[PDB]
Amino acid sequence: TAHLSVVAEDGSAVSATSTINLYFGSKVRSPVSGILFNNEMDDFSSPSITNEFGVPPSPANFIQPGKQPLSSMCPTIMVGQDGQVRMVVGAAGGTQITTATALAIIYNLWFGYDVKRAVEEPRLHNQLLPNVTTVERNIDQAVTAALETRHHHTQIASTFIAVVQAIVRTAGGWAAASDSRKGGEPAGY
Amino acid sequence: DNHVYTRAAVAADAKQCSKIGRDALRDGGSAVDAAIAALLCVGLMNAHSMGIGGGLFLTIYNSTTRKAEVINAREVAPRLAFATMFNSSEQSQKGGLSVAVPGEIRGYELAHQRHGRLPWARLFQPSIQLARQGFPVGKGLAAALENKRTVIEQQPVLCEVFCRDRKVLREGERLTLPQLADTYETLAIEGAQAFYNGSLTAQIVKDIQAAGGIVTAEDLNNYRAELIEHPLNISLGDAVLYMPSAPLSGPVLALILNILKGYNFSRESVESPEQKGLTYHRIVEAFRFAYAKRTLLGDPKFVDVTEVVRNMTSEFFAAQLRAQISDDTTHPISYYKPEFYT
Ligand SMILES: *[C@@H]1O[C@H](CO)[C@@H](O)[C@H](O)[C@H]1NC(C)=O
Ligand SMILES: *[C@@H]1O[C@H](CO)[C@@H](O)[C@H](O)[C@H]1NC(C)=O
Ligand SMILES: *[C@@H]1O[C@H](CO)[C@@H](O)[C@H](O)[C@H]1NC(C)=O
Ligand SMILES: *[C@@H]1O[C@H](CO)[C@@H](O)[C@H](O)[C@H]1NC(C)=O
Numbered sequence: 001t002a003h004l005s006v007v008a009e010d011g012s013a014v015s016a017t018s019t020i021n022l023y024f025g026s027k028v029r030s031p032v033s034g035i036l037f038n039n040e041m042d043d044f045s046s047p048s049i050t051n052e053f054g055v056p057p058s059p060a061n062f063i064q065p066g067k068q069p070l071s072s073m074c075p076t077i078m079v080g081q082d083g084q085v086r087m088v089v090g091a092a093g094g095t096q097i098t099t100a101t102a103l104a105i106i107y108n109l110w111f112g113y114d115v116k117r118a119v120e121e122p123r124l125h126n127q128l129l130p131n132v133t134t135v136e137r138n139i140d141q142a143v144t145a146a147l148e149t150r151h152h153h154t155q156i157a158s159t160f161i162a163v164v165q166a167i168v169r170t171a172g173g174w175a176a177a178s179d180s181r182k183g184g185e186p187a188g189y
Numbered sequence: 190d191n192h193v194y195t196r197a198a199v200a201a202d203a204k205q206c207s208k209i210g211r212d213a214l215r216d217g218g219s220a221v222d223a224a225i226a227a228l229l230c231v232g233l234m235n236a237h238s239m240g241i242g243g244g245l246f247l248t249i250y251n252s253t254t255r256k257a258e259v260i261n262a263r264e265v266a267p268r269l270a271f272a273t274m275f276n277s278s279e280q281s282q283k284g285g286l287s288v289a290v291p292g293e294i295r296g297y298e299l300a301h302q303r304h305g306r307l308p309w310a311r312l313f314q315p316s317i318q319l320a321r322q323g324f325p326v327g328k329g330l331a332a333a334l335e336n337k338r339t340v341i342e343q344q345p346v347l348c349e350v351f352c353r354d355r356k357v358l359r360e361g362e363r364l365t366l367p368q369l370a371d372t373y374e375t376l377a378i379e380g381a382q383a384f385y386n387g388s389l390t391a392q393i394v395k396d397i398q399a400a401g402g403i404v405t406a407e408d409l410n411n412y413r414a415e416l417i418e419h420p421l422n423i424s425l426g427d428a429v430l431y432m433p434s435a436p437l438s439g440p441v442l443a444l445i446l447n448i449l450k451g452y453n454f455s456r457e458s459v460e461s462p463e464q465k466g467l468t469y470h471r472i473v474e475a476f477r478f479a480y481a482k483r484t485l486l487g488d489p490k491f492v493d494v495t496e497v498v499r500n501m502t503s504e505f506f507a508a509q510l511r512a513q514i515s516d517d518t519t520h521p522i523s524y525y526k527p528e529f530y531t
């Protein structure tokens with residue numbers, strides 16, 4: 001998955017998330033065209049496949065001809081009451097996209113972290129099933145303790161949680177951040 | 190650089206692609222032209238993540254009409270697909286049967302018809318160059334290549350571009366994509382119709398069916414990107430947030446933030462370990478409640494989600510969930526009422 005955020009000079013904006021699903025999608029590459037084909041059918045629920053221990057199939061998300069599979073993607077644009085763009089934000093990282101996107105927004109809009117900090121700040125994730133709270137390696141350990149004494153079982157992600165790209169309007173203009181977890185970098189004028 | 194820009198900004202997950210988007214802006218392109226141009230580049234530099242073999246959504250805001258729209262160009266199950274086609278994760282994840290009908294190119298075309306200022310061909314030009322000349326493998330792709338070393342190395346068609354002496358490329362080594370370059374060129378000149386009802390179409394169908402898939406020409410001919418003129422929105426303070434509804438996760442996001450807005454978080458919320466700990470606990474509980482409701486979501490054309498989404502975007506409903514968040518403890522799964530039917 002890749003997330004992209006754009007603000008133009010006229011204040012117009014695009015938030016765009018795109019995916020072939022898993023790494024190299026289906027692993028089917030055309031030798032003639034070079035096109036690498038998605039494995040998006042894997043985002044449907046299937047009655048014969050158990051993913052998580054104790055998690056049943058979701059009938060709302062079964063395969064039907066012509067149907068689109070449920071997605072965690074959430075490309076977002078925040079606009080001010082005055083009609084000016086305030087934030088352009090989204091993420092990659094499967095079911096972690098939605099929590100990561102919420103965090104970027106919370107971090108900037110409520111905690112008052114600038115966009116780079118909002119993107120780099122350690123994240124965490126809980127999706128109810130499974131019954132575990134995943135934290136990034138460098139999370140404030142007062143957070144870990146606050147969760148554990150409240151009975152959350154926590155575990156540390158072996159890599160990182162999601163990948164966020166964001167732009168936020170500031171005093172100095174448009175501040176942009178690409179997530180160092182994947183190594184992108186912004187560009188502008 | 191600090192990356193604060195006076196006039197325009199592109200944030201992508203590869204530097205070269207952010208620059209390509211920025212250059213399109215600088216040459217007079219709309220926000221959409223820059224995004225399309227950047228996306229064609231990410232399809233190359235992060236070939237493992239996205240590209241013309243997949244699908245996307247665009248949330249687009251016009252600062253003149255002050256209207257937001259969404260473009261739905263996510264893949265669709267082929268006409269021959271059915272509920273019980275797979276019996277193992279392996280069947281749904283690997284090979285042609287795992288392939289859904291790609292929407293990406295129809296999605297660029299629709300966004301561009303509505304918002305483009307640069308010519309279609311100009312959007313592809315710098316990516317055509319990049320794929321022919323090559324680029325150093327970046328950090329993300331290097332990691333993906335490592336992760337999937339086994340399958341890559343044993344499949345000749347993938348090792349063809351993704352290996353160096355039968356071994357997966359590593360960070361800093363040159364990756365070239367000469368067939369995609371040709372394909373991007375065709376797309377640039379012949380237009381989207383080349384993919385869906387044109388010179389690329391039969392080849393696509395043949396690649397997918399050779400690997401055991403069931404996508405046919407009719408599937409491609411039939412694919413349509415969709416304009417959504419009324420995206421989901423929620424109100425936060427003086428701001429509105431535009432995001433896609435089902436089949437994407439706007440409703441999940443909306444519910445997370447609506448639950449949380451009632452706590453009135455501020456920089457104080459994180460100033461002491463006492464407050465910070467409670468704050469993050471509250472966050473995690475809102476995640477839990479929000480994902481409980483997510484299992485009802487699905488393609489709104491096949492599933493009636495009108496009221497599921499009404500609830501998830503409703504502040505009162507979020508207030509009802511916020512009141513079940515205990516400040517001193519988390520709860521067992523059933524506390525959050527995850528539902529699998531209605
Ligand atoms: C799985 O099982 C169903 C029902 O027996 C059958 O229709 C289908 O073709 C099988 N698919 C695969 C990929 O094994
Ligand atoms: C926004 O709307 C204006 C006026 O209708 C139009 O000229 C312009 O093309 C639109 N901007 C974008 C980025 O599509
Ligand atoms: C192009 O379009 C028509 C129907 O839309 C179809 O009959 C024809 O075979 C298509 N051509 C290709 C190459 O898919
Ligand atoms: C938010 O939701 C719906 C869109 O159909 C509508 O009630 C309202 O006009 C929307 N708000 C904005 C600012 O578009």
Ligand SMILES: *[C@@H]1O[C@H](CO)[C@@H](O)[C@H](O)[C@H]1NC(C)=O
Nearest residue numbers: 496497499500505506509531
């Ligand atoms: C929506 O939430 C209400 C509680 O506010 C509940 O009674 C109702 O069952 C829900 N409706 C749907 C369609 O899920």
Ligand SMILES: *[C@@H]1O[C@H](CO)[C@@H](O)[C@H](O)[C@H]1NC(C)=O
Nearest residue numbers: 131151152519520521522523
């Ligand atoms: C899940 O974790 C919570 C948090 O401690 C715990 O109360 C519960 O017993 C666990 N199991 C289930 C099925 O919810």
Ligand SMILES: [Cl-]
Nearest residue numbers: 002003092202
């Ligand atoms: Cl990304």
Ligand SMILES: [Cl-]
Nearest residue numbers: 034366368369
């Ligand atoms: Cl190639």
Ligand code: NA
Nearest residue numbers: 116176177192
């Ligand atoms: Na930055």
